[PDB]
Design an enzyme around this catalytic site. Structure first.
Site, PDB file in Angstrom:
ATOM      1  N   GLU D  50       0.859  -1.179   0.000  1.00  0.00           N
ATOM      2  CA  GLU D  50       0.000   0.000   0.000  1.00  0.00           C
ATOM      3  C   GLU D  50       0.898   1.233   0.000  1.00  0.00           C
ATOM      4  O   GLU D  50       1.602   1.497   0.980  1.00  0.00           O
ATOM      5  CB  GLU D  50      -0.933   0.009   1.208  1.00  0.00           C
ATOM      6  CG  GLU D  50      -1.989  -1.080   1.224  1.00  0.00           C
ATOM      7  CD  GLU D  50      -2.959  -0.914   2.381  1.00  0.00           C
ATOM      8  OE1 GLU D  50      -2.852   0.094   3.114  1.00  0.00           O
ATOM      9  OE2 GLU D  50      -3.831  -1.788   2.561  1.00  0.00           O
ATOM     10  N   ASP D  61      -6.286   8.544   9.519  1.00  0.00           N
ATOM     11  CA  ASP D  61      -4.976   8.049   9.918  1.00  0.00           C
ATOM     12  C   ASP D  61      -4.780   8.165  11.425  1.00  0.00           C
ATOM     13  O   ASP D  61      -5.174   9.156  12.046  1.00  0.00           O
ATOM     14  CB  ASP D  61      -3.871   8.819   9.193  1.00  0.00           C
ATOM     15  CG  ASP D  61      -3.818   8.504   7.711  1.00  0.00           C
ATOM     16  OD1 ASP D  61      -4.674   7.728   7.237  1.00  0.00           O
ATOM     17  OD2 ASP D  61      -2.917   9.032   7.024  1.00  0.00           O
TER      18      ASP D  61
END
Ligand SMILES: N#C[C@@H]1N[C@@H](CF)[C@H]1c1ccc(-c2c(F)cc(Cl)cc2F)cc1
Ligand SMILES: N#C[C@@H]1N[C@@H](CF)[C@H]1c1ccc(-c2c(F)cc(Cl)cc2F)cc1
Lengths: 247, 400, 405, 249
Positions: D50, D61
């Site tokens: 990724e 995040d």
């Protein structure tokens, strides 16, 4: 007649005006202030203005206001003023009391007039009492034979000036360039009462200028400043002021 | 005119509350203000100008809000808040200064002076003077100018001058004395916009008349929302302007209790208070005969309160008349009681009240416990507590 | 009565097409609570019991209606035009923001939510949220940047007095746009019992529409008041534009009025050419930000540019999507106003009318003066005075040298 | 037609294991150092990489990724640096998809970004803040340039939105999250046979083994950034443990 009638009478008979000196009770302390008021009698003051220190004197200049602040800081009481009046009388002086009206109300208007007369006092100067609120004062003024010195101003209306002079007895206080003699003319045009003038007299020459048209020369702030420097300066300045009123 | 004084300004006749305890040097301008007020009091152009400003500029009418979440803390009584805190400038004082500033321009005066403690009445006066194009000078105690730098800048942004008074105790009492001396010397072009329902005639009557709109509105509003007149109307009393304003419309209602709450500071038994009726005595002060805090000789003693607006040794003469007549009761509220009401009003209703107004709320809570469930109490919320957030934060230890 | 929905977005929240402005640019982890809020709002916006509850709070608690004041002493500086001020500064808490938090807090109660979170710049919306949460018994948590918490100590205590909890966001740029990011993360974790009270007319559907509806009362009142005092519809309605809630609230009633100009004024900071500004429409470009496709300040890669303004309320890199639609459609013009122009109008409104405006509102006042010069004598301009400037006195005093050193 | 990541899970299923899916943000600590770390992931047994595009406001995040993307943007990382990393991963014999918030893609141009990513050897795109409701342009571009579209599902997803999200996904579906993760995979597998990757703050070999029991892919990201902050030797060591965890036999 008035209690101060004979005083101004012997002044006019001598081609002079009356010297009226003010001092606040308890500055720098109560005994020192009484010694200073006695000195005014010895040095040639005709009438003494014994001031009652008040916590909020709105009509007092900066010199007198700071002396009454100091006197109150020292713990002066209203009865101390009547003790000074008694001391001035015994020394052969002639004294009136200048006070704001609330200490009189707290004391009792009738009781204060009684004790003021019993101390030898001759009159009461009321800077924040107008005749419109002087119902109780007028009664006590007559019952105890006390002069009532009301104030007039350059802004007084003709109806109010005549009413204020009509209510006065003893002399009229005229407080304030040429507005002071013009105010004296307005009073003399409606009544034959003596007129006192106090505009911050400072020297012998200034005392003579007022004495040319006023029946009494009122000195206050200058005597307090002289007393701050010392007692000998007070009698020296009062001596100069006593010579100016005869010119 | 039924509860008005005589031509001399005396309430109650032989009692002599009020009057004019001023020097002769100020009587010409006082007769001029009295004649001007009695002339514009009945002029429709004046009443129309005032109503337009009150509505479109000040935000009147102010709402009446039922603080239902306060009920459980007021003995299940029903507390209605007269929301003067929502006025322009944040207090009831805008009502007084709008009427007097309009009058000052009707008279031809070009200069307006006013006293102030921590700054509320000075900001209101400067606000009205900027609106009407009047030169404005605010007198403020030197102790107050030193710790109220933002309120000074507030009046300064409004175009007014601010003078720090360093004579006397350098506080509100002495600022009034200095505006007095200013008015004596400049009475030709200057109007004195006094900040409470005291002073000499006609100021106690005139200020009350300008604050009357509070009670008139509140009486109409309470009958609409509750279906009846209230069981009590309460307010805090410093000089007495906001209290007399809300009390007046209810004076002739037999069932309506009227209770004014004054600042008790640390307690009446401690000498650090401002409870003029609880611990004062009659006397002549600031141009009227009324109650004040004085010693045995008649000297003004210092007052202490965590409120600035109630930190005043005197009180209006019409309140002294209503106290003698038994129409209004005056009870003390301490600093602690007011701050508990302050925080309670914040947590329960989301309204941050002026610490002055929190004295009225605290008294309403005590009174609601007395009157029981269902009792209707109208409380005059005189001002908002934005000015007091820092004082209240220190109190509850929310700062550090 | 529920007002019509002629200018609403589609069911996906898109203005002017199924791929237009707005929509929902949020993660899937949040779509459950957003569909719940959307369904709750669509049920309550037509519930007479809800509109009665809100009206009762707007009238007796918030102080509505706010007056419309004609600032006659400003006419000389506005080209002899006539300036009418919608006095939202007189609302409870002192800004238009009270209209938003009252409806959303009522909605949180209707949904059975017990916890309310919200962002705030320098404290204005956090105080507003904490106020409504105290009034309605809701637990309140305010997210605020660590730079703003250290600089706004009194607003934090103001929120704690109201019973709310303040959390300092020490991540990112530690300001408004990062407090929103933290409140968004809080919602993803506590959506079961937490309502997000968003502070402007932006974000994902249904928040641009919902916030606009709670502010439409401003324009509805003003449109009636201006006809009573001026005798006709105004030539222009203006307002300052941060996220766009106060502007869209007064704009909406005049959208179908053909001759009424609509001008929103945004903060240009030091100037649009200086890079220290917040002029979203003037110097920004379209993009997805904070849940909606609209305008934002972004660089060549799509990263958010920090914004600067002397006002804290206009200091925001984005703008609501309904404003972007109205710009593209040509209904509303968006013009910049610098710090100096606003502070000049701040002081003018102080000296002339005795009204201390919020610095955010001073941008709208400044633009109204410029618009009055362009429109000329007799023009009728309605200005949304969105807030009072008691919070901005310290900043204005330093600007005009009233504090010294 | 089969997805680009289809054969990878087929091969992993044949060897009785789950796919190890490793995340690293481009440009942390710098762009060359991150490319070296992404290359090390391929060398150490990562089946899918990724490649994260650092974004100025990454709400999904966690703190570890957030501080790493902040530092990468302070270093001046660009979106084109992510395409270069995809080239390097393809050159190193790896398989790379790009995880990114949607605004950088909108800025770049959606069709343009799909074209350039497909040219750089990219196989798909993970879109954490793009739901299928806003993916009309993205659906057209993923079909044009044969890119897999990995949408996210959550424990709180409604049964209607979950089926719509799975239906709209190609390659694998990202299940982001006590027992919520296995229950979420069961819901996806109840309506489709698409591979499901699970991200769960994986930090050790034992955690990867627990997820490999019910999931087709194990997604590790925050633990890799922490190991890279220590150094490449620590990152190679951790990736080997995770590669051992996904293998069940
Ligand atoms: N003599 C005398 C007194 N020195 C102080 C105490 F009485 C001084 C004073 C006199 C008058 C006032 C007054 C006021 F407060 C308000 C208004 Cl509107 C008008 C006034 F005239 C205030 C202080
Ligand atoms: N993905 C993603 C993004 N990380 C940031 C930038 F878009 C983060 C984000 C997502 C959503 C929002 C949002 C909001 F501002 C208001 C409301 Cl009411 C609801 C929201 F969901 C804010 C920030």
């Amino acid at each position: 007649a008035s209690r101060l009638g004979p005083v101004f009478d012997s002044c006019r008979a001598n081609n002079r005006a009356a010297l009226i000196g003010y001092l606040p009770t308890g500055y720098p302390d109560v005994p020192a202030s009484v010694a200073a008021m006695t000195a005014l009698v010895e040095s040639g003051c005709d009438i003494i203005e014994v001031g009652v220190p008040y916590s909020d004197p709105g009509m007092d200049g900066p010199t007198i206001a700071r002396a009454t602040e100091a006197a109150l800081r020292g713990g002066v009481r209203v009865r101390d003023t009547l003790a000074a009046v008694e001391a001035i009388s015994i020394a052969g002086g002639r004294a009136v009391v200048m006070t704001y009206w609330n200490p009189v109300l707290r004391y009792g208007v009738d009781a204060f007039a009684r004790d003021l007369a019993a101390a030898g006092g001759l009159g009461l100067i009321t800077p924040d009492l107008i005749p419109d609120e002087a119902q109780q004062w007028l009664a006590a003024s007559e019952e105890h034979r006390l002069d009532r010195i009301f104030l007039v101003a350059p802004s007084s209306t003709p109806e109010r000036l005549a009413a204020t002079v009509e209510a006065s007895r003893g002399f009229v206080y005229a407080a304030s360039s040429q507005a002071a003699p013009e105010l004296v003319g307005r009073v003399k045009a409606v009544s034959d009462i003596p007129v006192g003038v106090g505009l911050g007299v400072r020297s012998r020459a200034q005392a003579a200028q007022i004495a040319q048209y006023a029946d009494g020369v009122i000195v206050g702030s200058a005597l307090v400043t002289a007393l701050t420097e010392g007692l000998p300066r007070l009698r020296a300045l009062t001596g100069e002021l006593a010579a100016g009123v005869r010119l | 005119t039924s509860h008005d004084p005589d031509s001399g300004g005396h309430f109650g006749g032989p009692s002599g509350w009020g009057g004019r305890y001023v020097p002769e040097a100020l009587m010409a301008v006082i007769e001029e203000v009295t004649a001007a007020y009695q002339k514009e009091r009945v002029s429709q152009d004046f009443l129309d100008d005032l109503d337009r400003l009150q509505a479109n500029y000040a935000g009147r009418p102010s709402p009446l809000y039922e603080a239902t979440r306060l009920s459980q803390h007021a003995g299940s009584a029903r507390i209605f808040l007269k929301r003067e805190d929502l006025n322009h400038t944040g207090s009831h004082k805008i009502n007084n200064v709008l009427g007097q500033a309009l009058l000052a321009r009707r008279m031809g005066k070009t200069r307006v002076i006013a006293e102030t403690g921590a700054g509320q009445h000075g900001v209101a006066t400067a606000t009205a003077c900027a609106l009407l194009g009047l030169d404005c000078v605010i007198y403020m105690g030197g102790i107050d100018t030193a710790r109220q730098a933002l309120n000074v800048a507030r009046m300064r942004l409004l175009g007014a001058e601010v003078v720090a008074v360093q004579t006397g105790s350098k506080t509100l009492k002495d600022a009034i004395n200095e505006a007095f001396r200013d008015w004596v010397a400049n009475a030709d072009n200057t109007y004195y916009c006094f900040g409470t329902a005291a002073g000499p005639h006609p100021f106690p009557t005139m200020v009350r008349d300008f604050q009357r709109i509070i009670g008139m509105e509140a009486r109409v509003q309470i009958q609409g929302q509750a279906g009846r007149l209230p069981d009590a109307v309460v307010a805090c009393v410093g000089g007495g302007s906001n209290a007399i304003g809300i009390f007046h419309a209810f004076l002739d209602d037999p069932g309506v209790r009227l209770v004014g709450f004054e600042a008790a500071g640390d307690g009446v038994e401690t000498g650090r208070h401002a409870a003029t009726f609880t611990a004062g005595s009659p006397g002549a002060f600031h141009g009227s005969f009324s109650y004040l805090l004085q010693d045995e000789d008649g000297q003004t003693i210092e007052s202490h309160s965590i409120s600035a607006g109630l930190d005043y040794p005197g009180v209006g003469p019409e309140h002294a008349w209503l106290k003698e007549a038994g129409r209004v009761d005056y009870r003390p509220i301490t600093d602690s009681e007011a701050m508990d009401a302050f925080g309670l009003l914040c947590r329960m209703e989301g309204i941050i009240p002026a610490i002055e107004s929190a004295h009225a709320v605290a008294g309403a809570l005590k009174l609601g416990v007395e009157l029981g469930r269902g009792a209707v109490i109208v409380v005059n919320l005189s001002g908002r507590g934005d000015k007091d957030v820092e004082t209240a934060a220190k109190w509850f230890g929310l700062l550090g």
